[PDB]
Structures are given as C-alpha cells and as structure tokens.
C-alpha cells in the first residue's frame, strides 16, 4: 500500500500514473480515471514510429542520417543533421515527419491497427505528418502500458533487430542496478497542454511498465513529467 497520489500534490500538478509489474501482472496507480482517457500521442509517438520506420525500411539503422533541410525551428539542436537515436533523443520532430510520409497513409493504418496503437485512427492522407501532433490520433495511459507491453514481449510485427535498434535508442537513464527507458511528449495543441513519459524500467530481474500523464499549465509543469515518474518508481521502492 503506497500513495502514488503524494508526489503529484507536492509538485502542484495534476495527472495520473499507471506501473504495471510484469512479474507479478500487478498494477499501481494514482487518478484511475485518467489512465482510461485518451490523449494526443505528441512524442510519445516516436517509439511507434521508429518500429515501423525500421521495420518497412524507410530508415535503415540507427545511425542513418536524414539532412536537415535549413529551415530554422524553434530549437537549435532540431536545425542540424541527425539520425534517429539522435532525433529521439531531442524529440525533433522534422526527422519523424519525413519517416511518417515516407511510410505512407496505407502502410502507416496497417501498422496501427495491427498493433491496436491507441484510437487506431491517422486520418486522411494529407494529415500523415501529424496526425500524432494535432488528431486525430489519441491515446490513453492504460493503452500506453499494453503497447509497451506487448512489444517487450515480441508479440507484435517487428523482426528482432527492429526490436533491438528501438529498445537501444529509448535508454534514458542506466546504472548498475537499473536500466530506464522511455521517452516525454508535450501536447500543446490543446488546452491545458498534456504532458508524458511512458517506457519501463528493468531492475530487480523485473519490468515495470510506466505511463505518466499531467496537464502543463506552465513550463515548470514540464519537468513534473520525469520527476513524478521518478518519485513513484522510488515509491515502490525502485531507482
Ligand atoms: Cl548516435
Ligand atoms: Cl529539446
Ligand atoms: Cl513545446
């Protein structure tokens, strides 16, 4: 028995939580009604999009470049050439929308609907560079978890170098005790902004299988993201 809820109070945030133990199939949470709704993907999307973009070929390895195309973003490390490691790492979004066209409309519905990613809906063709950054793709956090989930697990229609290029790609944080993966998104199309990290952590021989969502209402909501992910992992005695 542990309070989740706690570590979202002390920061002045709202949201939710879901953990999902593999080991013992046991879930902990704070806000259950949350971790039901649907939100867009924002960056979160890029672990999706990585898996089919290797998987069809449109990017052949980690290491391959996409050039940037000169035109100055709003981030500077976003206005250089960069490779997919790289790109999800900085969340640039310029390289993720040339893999999403170059997939294509039809390959990219077979792929979500074979995974059963989200809400299963991309919209029409001329939406292909974003549909994940303004609809209609949505997502909740329990969906999250069973997409994480059933990819740890090899069940879903990538090869096992597609698997281990992404896996590879989404360590964020590794010590000797623990190896943390996943990745942040930022919706800002709507209002209040959302908020996510969603990955897993290895530790203990164990995967805990995580999913944050807040709402930003300012930009110091924004490392809430990470840091209530942190607080509850330690929480359940983790990290
Ligand atoms: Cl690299
Ligand atoms: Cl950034
Ligand atoms: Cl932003």
Same mark, same amino acid.
């Given at each position: ?96 929308? =040339? #893999?999403?066209? !170059?997939? /294509? ?12 990613? $989200?809400? @299963? ?57 623990? =190896? #943390?993966?996943? !990745?942040? /998104? ?12 969603? $990955?897993? @952590? ?38």
């Amino acid at each position: 028995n542990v309070n989740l809820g706690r570590s979202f109070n002390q920061l002045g945030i709202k949201g939710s939580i879901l953990i999902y133990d593999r080991n013992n199939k046991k879930f902990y949470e704070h806000n259950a009604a949350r971790n039901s709704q649907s939100f867009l993907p924002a960056s979160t999307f890029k672990i999706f999009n990585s898996l089919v973009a290797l998987e069809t070929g449109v990017i052949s390895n980690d290491v391959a470049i996409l050039t940037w195309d000169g035109m100055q973003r709003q981030f500077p490390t976003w206005n250089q050439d960069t490779n997919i490691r790289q790109a999800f790492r900085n969340s640039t979004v310029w390289f993720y929308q =040339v #893999l999403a066209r !170059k997939i /294509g409309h039809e390959r990219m519905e077979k792929f979500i609907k074979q995974v059963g990613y $989200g809400n @299963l809906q991309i919209g029409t063709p001329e939406q292909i560079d974003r549909f994940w950054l303004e609809g209609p793709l949505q997502i909740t956090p329990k969906q999250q978890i069973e997409f994480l989930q059933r990819l740890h697990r090899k069940e879903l229609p990538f090869s096992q170098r597609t698997l281990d290029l992404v896996q590879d790609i989404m360590i964020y944080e590794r010590t000797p005790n623990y =190896v #943390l993966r996943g !990745k942040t /998104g930022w919706a800002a199309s709507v209002t209040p902004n959302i908020g996510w990290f969603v $990955g897993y @952590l290895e530790q203990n021989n164990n995967v805990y299988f995580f999913a944050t969502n807040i709402d930003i209402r300012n930009n110091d909501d924004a490392a809430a993201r990470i840091e209530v992910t942190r607080r509850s992992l330690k929480a359940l005695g983790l990290l």
